[PDB]
C-alpha cells in the first residue's frame, strides 16, 4: 500500500465567477453563519458588527444589523430549531437574539461578558436552544437558551485548560437530547471531554498520553456515524506543529491514530505544519486536513493513509466536504472544489482580492423535479461576502 505521494492540482488559473455579494462590512468578515430553515445569512466582522441578509436573492435582501459588540464578532451561530441567534466577540461579549415575526425581526433577548476574549462558540447541531464557547484563559462554558424569552442558563463553567481553549465540538449528537457531550482543546496540548450538564471531565488527554510530545491544539472535527459504524464520538485533532490525533471519545479518549502529517525541512516555519482545518466525507470514509503550508492531505479513514495530497498557493483556511466533493478556502482568495473520490479539480471560486477566511454551503431545498446548484458563501478578509453557484 501507500508510501508514495499522489498529488494533484490546482493548475495556475477581470473574473470573478460570483453570482451576488455583501459589502456592509468596513473591515474583515470573521464569522459566517446560516439559519437552519430560513434563507437568512449572518456575517460577523472586524467592524464590531453582525449583519443579517438573504441567501436566496440576487442581490441579497438586507435584514438588519445586530449591535452591541465590544470588538470583532468572531461567531454567528443559529440554534438547531432556529429561533435564537448566538453571537460572540473578541472582548468576551456573547449575545442572544430571538427570532421574532416569522424570523424577520431578531430582538436582543440576553447577553453576557464572562471572559476577556472568546476564541470560538458553536451551537448544538441537534439539541435545540443550546451553545458552548471557549476563552483565552482556557475556560469552557456551556449555556442553554430559555424557549419563552431567551434568558441565559449556565450548564458548566470549566477552568481546566491552562493555555487558551482553541476549539471545541459537540459529540454523541445523534444519541439523544439528554446526552450533551462536548470535546474541547487547548495550546497546553490538552483535550477534555465533558458532560455539559454535570460539568465534569469525562476524560483529559495531556502531553503524557501522546508520546510526551508538545502539541498545542488548533482544530477538532467529529466523524459522522457512517465511517465509525455507530460511534458518535470519533474526533480528529490537529496541532499547530503538524501532529494529527484521532480519538475514541466513547472509550475514554483512546488514541486510534497519532501521526505527524508533514515531515518539515529544518528551514521551513514550524507553524507551516499547522493543521488549520479538518473535515470528513460522510458519504465516502475519507478525512481531509488543511495546513498553513497550503497542503491538503486527503486520508482514507480505514487504512489511515494519504490518498491524495494537494498543494495550494497559500494557507488553507477551511476544509468542507459536501456530498462527493471537497471544498477549500485558501488565503489567496480562492474557494476550490474537488472530487473527493478522484482528486479532479471540479471548479474554482474567484473574485476575492484578499483571503477567504470562512465559508458556507447552501442547498437547493426544493427538488419538486428541477434540482438547482449548490451555493458557496464566503467570509472575506476584505469584508465582502460572495455568492457562487457551484457544479451539481
UniProtKB/Swiss-Prot annotation:
User: Which keywords label this protein?
Assistant: Repeat, WD repeat
The UniProt record's further free-text remark is: Present with 19700 molecules/cell in log phase SD medium.
- Source organism (scientific name): Saccharomyces cerevisiae (strain ATCC 204508 / S288c) (Baker's yeast)
Does the record bear Repeat in its keywords?
yes
Its biological purpose: May be involved in the late step of 60S ribosomal subunit assembly or modification in the cytoplasm.
The entry describes its oligomerization and partners as: Interacts strongly with QSR1. Part of an oligomeric protein complex that is loosely associated with ribosomes.
- GO-annotated cellular components: cytoplasm; cytosol
What Gene Ontology terms for biological process does this UniProt record contain?
ribosomal large subunit assembly; ribosomal large subunit biogenesis
Short name of one Pfam family: WD40
Q: What is the lineage of its organism?
A: Eukaryota, Fungi, Dikarya, Ascomycota, Saccharomycotina
Mind listing the GO molecular function terms for this protein?
A: unfolded protein binding
Descriptive protein name: Ribosome assembly protein SQT1
What the entry lists under Gene3D superfamilies is as follows: YVTN repeat-like/Quinoprotein amine dehydrogenase
Q: Does the keyword Signal apply?
A: no
- Positions annotated as WD repeat: 24-63, 68-107, 110-153, 160-204, 270-309, 311-348
Amino acid at each position: 500500500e501507500v508510501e508514495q505521494d499522489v498529488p494533484v492540482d490546482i493548475e495556475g488559473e477581470m473574473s470573478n465567477n460570483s453570482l451576488t455579494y455583501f459589502d456592509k462590512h468596513t473591515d474583515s468578515v470573521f464569522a459566517i453563519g446560516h439559519h437552519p430553515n430560513l434563507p437568512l445569512v449572518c456575517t460577523g466582522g472586524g467592524d464590531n458588527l453582525a449583519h443579517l441578509w438573504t441567501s436566496h436573492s440576487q442581490p441579497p435582501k438586507f435584514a438588519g444589523t445586530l449591535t452591541g459588540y465590544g470588538e470583532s464578532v468572531i461567531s454567528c451561530s443559529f440554534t438547531s430549531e432556529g429561533g435564537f441567534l448566538v453571537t460572540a466577540d473578541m472582548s468576551g461579549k456573547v449575545l442572544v437574539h430571538m427570532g421574532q415575526k416569522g424570523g424577520a425581526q431578531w430582538k436582543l433577548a440576553s447577553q453576557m461578558q464572562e471572559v476577556e476574549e472568546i476564541v470560538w462558540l458553536k451551537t448544538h447541531p441537534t439539541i435545540a436552544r443550546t451553545f458552548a464557547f471557549g476563552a483565552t484563559d482556557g475556560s469552557v462554558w456551556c449555556y442553554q437558551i430559555n424557549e419563552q424569552d431567551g434568558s441565559l442558563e449556565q450548564l458548566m463553567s470549566g477552568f481546566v485548560h491552562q493555555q487558551d481553549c482553541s476549539m471545541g465540538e459537540f459529540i454523541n449528537t445523534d444519541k439523544g437530547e439528554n446526552t450533551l457531550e462536548l470535546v474541547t482543546c487547548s495550546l497546553d496540548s490538552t483535550i477534555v471531554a465533558w458532560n455539559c450538564f454535570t460539568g465534569q471531565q469525562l476524560f483529559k488527554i495531556t502531553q503524557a498520553e501522546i508520546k510526551g510530545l508538545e502539541a498545542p491544539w488548533i482544530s477538532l472535527s467529529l466523524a459522522p456515524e457512517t465511517l465509525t459504524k455507530g460511534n458518535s464520538g470519533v474526533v480528529a485533532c490537529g496541532s499547530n506543529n503538524g501532529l494529527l490525533a484521532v480519538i475514541n471519545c466513547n472509550n475514554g479518549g483512546a488514541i486510534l491514530h497519532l501521526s505527524t502529517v508533514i515531515e518539515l525541512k529544518p528551514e521551513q516555519d514550524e507553524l507551516d505544519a499547522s493543521i488549520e482545518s479538518i473535515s470528513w466525507s460522510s458519504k465516502f470514509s475519507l478525512m481531509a486536513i488543511g495546513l498553513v503550508c497550503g497542503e491538503i492531505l486527503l486520508y482514507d479513514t480505514s487504512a489511515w493513509r494519504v490518498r491524495h495530497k494537494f498543494v495550494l498557493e497559500d494557507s488553507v483556511t477551511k476544509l468542507m466536504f459536501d456530498n462527493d466533493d471537497l471544498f477549500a478556502s485558501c488565503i489567496n482568495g480562492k474557494v476550490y472544489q474537488f472530487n473527493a473520490r478522484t482528486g479532479q479539480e471540479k471548479f474554482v471560486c474567484v473574485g476575492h482580492n484578499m483571503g477567504v477566511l470562512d465559508f458556507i454551503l447552501l442547498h437547493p431545498v426544493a427538488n419538486t423535479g428541477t434540482e438547482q446548484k449548490r451555493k458557496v458563501i464566503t467570509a472575506g478578509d476584505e469584508g465582502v461576502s460572495l455568492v457562487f453557484e457551484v457544479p451539481n
